[PDB]
Every structure is written in structure tokens, then in C-alpha cells.
Design an enzyme around this catalytic site. Structure first.
Site, PDB file in Angstrom:
ATOM      1  N   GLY A   1       2.836   6.511   8.867  1.00  0.00           N
ATOM      2  CA  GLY A   1       4.111   6.622   8.200  1.00  0.00           C
ATOM      3  C   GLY A   1       5.131   5.592   8.621  1.00  0.00           C
TER       4      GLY A   1
ATOM      5  N   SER B   1       4.405   2.084   8.514  1.00  0.00           N
ATOM      6  CA  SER B   1       4.264   0.808   7.836  1.00  0.00           C
ATOM      7  C   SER B   1       5.575   0.466   7.140  1.00  0.00           C
ATOM      8  CB  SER B   1       3.099   0.830   6.838  1.00  0.00           C
ATOM      9  OG  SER B   1       3.353   1.658   5.729  1.00  0.00           O
TER      10      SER B   1
ATOM     11  N   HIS C   1       0.820  -1.223   0.000  1.00  0.00           N
ATOM     12  CA  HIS C   1       0.000   0.000   0.000  1.00  0.00           C
ATOM     13  C   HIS C   1       0.847   1.262   0.000  1.00  0.00           C
ATOM     14  CE1 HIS C   1       0.250  -0.059   4.565  1.00  0.00           C
ATOM     15  NE2 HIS C   1       0.136   1.250   4.420  1.00  0.00           N
TER      16      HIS C   1
ATOM     17  N   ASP D   1      -0.079  -7.590   1.455  1.00  0.00           N
ATOM     18  CA  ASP D   1       0.340  -6.190   1.504  1.00  0.00           C
ATOM     19  C   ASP D   1       1.856  -6.063   1.548  1.00  0.00           C
ATOM     20  OD1 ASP D   1       0.143  -3.439   1.455  1.00  0.00           O
ATOM     21  OD2 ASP D   1      -0.454  -3.248   3.567  1.00  0.00           O
TER      22      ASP D   1
END
Ligand SMILES: COc1ccc2nc(C)c(O[C@@H]3C[C@H]4C(=O)N[C@]5(C(=O)NS(=O)(=O)C6(C)CC6)C[C@H]5/C=C\CCCCC[C@H](NC(=O)OCC5(C)CC5)C(=O)N4C3)nc2c1
Ligand SMILES: [Zn+2]
Length: 197
Positions: free
Chosen positions: A155, A157, A75, A99
Site C-alpha cells: 500500500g 507504492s 499498477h 510503472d
């Protein structure tokens, strides 16, 4: 179509320094140089450490080296190349269902070792170099010992969850929130990375 544009590369713009006794963020490239590097895919900067701060034209997040792969979230990165000294580098792993994406780890980076401790006392490393105690609650969940607004996790991830011995337990994917307060985190287990490999 002669008009069609190409998306830029992901660019390393700094790192989380975990070398010493104090964790702290370092910036290694400013917004303008990031913009040019994203378009060319050519990044001459020296890379160091395990956790990189990365950016596209529109998003910033983290990426973490484990077993010679720089891993991050789909993502954030989509299918993008990463900038490197010799030009854009294509992803070697892509899994939208997890992801998850990964590129070969940059020359000069250091890789975390996959955890085999079986410990549930974890530590989340954020883009601000906060080291957040997290109790593991399942295969892909852990609760924050001290909840906080999701603003503080935004911010981060792609950053690591670490065991007490500093091994990689997983990659931070999503925040579980109530009325804007992060009570728990969702992460990609390192075993899922090891299987993807
Ligand atoms: C496009 O193809 C794909 C494929 C698979 C995929 N899989 C996902 C789980 C996913 O989720 C979205 C992105 C993610 C983050 O926001 N990720 C970070 C983060 O920091 N991003 S970031 O800022 O770096 C950014 C955007 C890159 C630049 C870590 C949080 C920090 C704060 C979150 C605040 C609000 C959001 C709360 C939310 N929660 C949640 O969805 O819970 C679900 C669950 C676990 C069942 C209950 C949440 O976290 N996310 C929503 N998108 C995708 C997209
Ligand atoms: Zn361990």
C-alpha cells in the site's frame, strides 16, 4: 453499448504529515465519500502536503508531489483521472514501461525538490508514516537497513524515497522479498521523472 461502465477517478483520502517533528498519517475522507468522489470526479476537500494517500474503488496506495506533478504508479492508478474541485483531471504523464503516471499537482499541495546530493543514505516514507532507512544499492534499488515482512510495505507504492536533506530521490515501485521478508525496494529514480517531464 449503452451498458458500458466508466472506471472512477483516483481519490485523495488522506496524507502523510511530515510538517513537524513527528510523521503521521491523516485521513481526510472516509470510504463512502471516497466512493461518491470517485464516481463524480468532484473533490472539494482542501489538499495539503507532499505525500497523499489515494484510493480507487479497489486499491489504495500513495502519490507524491515533485516539481509540481503528483506522481504515482501505473499498477495502482492505471490510466485513471484524479478527482479535483472542478471535476476529473486527465493524466499528464503515463509510462507503463516505468510503472509511472502523473497529474498536475493539486492546488494547495507542496512539492518535494528533486535531489542532487548524490547520497546513498535514503529514507522510505510509508502509508503508515513509517520512515524506513534504506541504503541505495543501484540506480533503482535500495536495501532496508532493517528488513520486515512485505505486509508493512503493501500500500506504499507511490511514496517517496528521500535523501538526508529531505529531497526526493525516487518513487517506491516494488518490493524485493525472500520468504515474505522485504530485504530491498525497487523505485523510479527522480531523474527518470525529470526526463519524463
Ligand atoms: C499494470 O501495469 C503494470 C506496469 C509496470 C509494473 N511494474 C512492476 C514492478 C509491478 O509490480 C507489481 C506491483 C508491485 C507492488 O506490489 N508494489 C508495492 C505496493 O505497495 N503496491 S500497492 O499495494 O500500493 C498496490 C497493488 C497498488 C495497490 C510496493 C509493494 C509492497 C509490497 C509488495 C508485496 C508483494 C509484491 C512484490 C512485487 N515485487 C516485484 O514485482 O519485484 C520485481 C523486481 C523489483 C524485479 C524484482 C511488487 O512489489 N509488485 C508487483 N507491476 C506493474 C504493472
Ligand atoms: Zn538530496
Amino acid at each position: 453499448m449503452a451498458s458500458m461502465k466508466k472506471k472512477g477517478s483516483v481519490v485523495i483520502v488522506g496524507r502523510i504529515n511530515l510538517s513537524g517533528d513527528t510523521a503521521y498519517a491523516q485521513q481526510t475522507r472516509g470510504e463512502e465519500g471516497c466512493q461518491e468522489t470517485s464516481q463524480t470526479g468532484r473533490d472539494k476537500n482542501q489538499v495539503e502536503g507532499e505525500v497523499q494517500i489515494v484510493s480507487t474503488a479497489t486499491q489504495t496506495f500513495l502519490a507524491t508531489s515533485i516539481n509540481g506533478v503528483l506522481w504515482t504508479v501505473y499498477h495502482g492508478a492505471g490510466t485513471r483521472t484524479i478527482a479535483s474541485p472542478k471535476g476529473p483531471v486527465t493524466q499528464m504523464y503515463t509510462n507503463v514501461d516505468k510503472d509511472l503516471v502523473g497529474w498536475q499537482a493539486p492546488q494547495g499541495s507542496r512539492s518535494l525538490t528533486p535531489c542532487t546530493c548524490g547520497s546513498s543514505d535514503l529514507y522510505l516514507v510509508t502509508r503508515h508514516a513509517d520512515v524506513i532507512p534504506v541504503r541505495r544499492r543501484g540506480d533503482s534499488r535500495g536495501s532496508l537497513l532493517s528488513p520486515r515482512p512485505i505486509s508493512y510495505l503493501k500500500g506504499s507504492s507511490g511514496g517517496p524515497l528521500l535523501c538526508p536533506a529531505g529531497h526526493a530521490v525516487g518513487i517506491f515501485r516494488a518490493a524485493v522479498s525472500t520468504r515474505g521478508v522485504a530485504k530491498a525496494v525497487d523505485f523510479i529514480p527522480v531523474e527518470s521523472l525529470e526526463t519524463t517531464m
